[PDB]
């Protein structure tokens, strides 16, 4: 019932228990952006886990970028002064009515529908 940003997934695969508890705090049918998928899969190749990381990611609902999301991303970038991939993920969460779970307080604080589960 929630969308997860790249940073948490990276933390998970990197062995942070904090990330494990972030995912467990939300019910299955958890979603990620196709961007997050690509960003994570890049790390999988570097650490040579590509096959097993893919099977783990495939348990997530993986949301591609519609033009709905494209339109919203453009708007959100101006409104919230966001980097574009941040905007696309935020747009993805909004249109599917999901809460955005992210470690980024800097950019996303003060934006409704955003939850920062942990810091360090």
């Amino acid at each position: 019932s929630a969308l997860f940003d790249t940073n948490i997934l990276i933390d998970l695969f990197s062995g942070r228990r904090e990330a494990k508890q972030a995912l467990e705090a939300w019910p299955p049918q958890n979603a990620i952006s196709l961007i997050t998928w690509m960003e994570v899969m890049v790390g999988a190749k570097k650490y040579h886990q590509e096959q097993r990381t893919r099977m783990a990611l495939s348990t997530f609902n993986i949301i591609n970028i519609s033009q709905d999301i494209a339109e919203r991303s453009v708007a959100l970038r101006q409104e919230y002064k966001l980097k574009l991939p941040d905007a696309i993920i935020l747009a993805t969460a909004q249109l599917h009515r999901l809460e955005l779970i992210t470690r980024n307080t800097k950019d996303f604080a003060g934006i409704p529908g955003v939850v920062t589960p942990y810091e360090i």
Binding site: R16, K20, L23, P27, Q49, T53
Partner: peptide
């Protein structure tokens, strides 16, 4: 009966434990 309940409870957990299995296997994978 219900008994429609309790077959709600499962399948309601897991789901929540492939999830736990998926997550736990994913932790420190790299």
């Amino acid at each position: 009966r219900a008994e429609l309940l309790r077959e709600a409870v499962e399948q309601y957990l897991e789901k929540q434990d492939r999830a736990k299995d998926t997550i736990s296997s994913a932790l420190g994978l790299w």
